[PDB]
Amino acid sequence: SVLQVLHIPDERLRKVAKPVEEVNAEIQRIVDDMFETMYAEEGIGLAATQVDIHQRIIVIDVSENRDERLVLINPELLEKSGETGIEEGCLSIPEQRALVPRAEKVKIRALDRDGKPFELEADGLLAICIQHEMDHLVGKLFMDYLSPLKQQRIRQKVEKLD
Ligand SMILES: [Cl-]
Ligand SMILES: [Co+2]
């Protein structure tokens, strides 16, 4: 199904996701629903934290054709380098963008939708999106890198979209 994506200032968005236990049909059901939710909302990423499922699951698709599904279960950063930034958005912070510092390249380890371990070296938009979504799983938002005043203005803007 298309799931309910939480917005700030909801305190559940601040919870630390627990590691996935077993990659079984039930976790695969969450993966598949998260993709449907992500695509429905016009996104390039979605962390399980954002739909109120506090396990370490991320879905990504940065492709032009929208047919390149990346699944990261229990992801682990192995190395990063360089620095970069673009004006980032967030499905949990609707209509607000802001440039944030990021590593230019990352290397990660993860389990795929079958539970198979793999490694991935990323750069560009994919590297930035991987960093964005891993932040969610530890209860971190892109606004957290801006000044406290900017964080209060972003909140009141989104929060006056009833
Ligand atoms: Cl992003
Ligand atoms: Co986000």
Annotated ligand binding at 132? The verdict is: yes
Distance 45 CA to ligand 1 centre (A): 7
Question: How do strand 57-60 and strand 70-81 relate by DSSP bridges?
Answer: antiparallel
Resolution, angstroms, 1 dp: 2.0
Sole residue written with tokens 């994919």: 126
Alpha-carbon distance of 14 to 115, in angstroms, equals: 26
Helix (H) or strand (E) run with residue 110 in it: strand 105-111
Bridge partners of 156?
A: none
- Domains of the chain, earliest start first: 1-162 (3.90.45.10)
Closest CA to 133 of 159, 154, 102: 102
Distance 19 CA to ligand 2 centre (A): 19
Ordered DSSP codes for 48-61: GGGGT--BSEEEE-
- Ligand number with the minimum distance to the CA of 130: 1
Alpha-carbon distance of 62 to 67, in angstroms, equals: 9
**Is 133 tagged catalytic?**
yes
Dihedral of the CA atoms 6, 9, 133, 64 (nearest 10)? 60
Experiment used for this model: X-ray
Distance 26 CA to ligand 2 centre (A): 24
Contact 70, 76 (CB under 8 A): no
Contact 91, 41 (CB under 8 A): yes
Which distant-in-sequence residues (6+ apart) come within 8 Å of 152 by Cβ?
none
Bridge partners of 110?
A: 118
What is the separation of C-alpha 67 from the centre of its chain, rounded to a whole number of angstroms?
Answer: 18
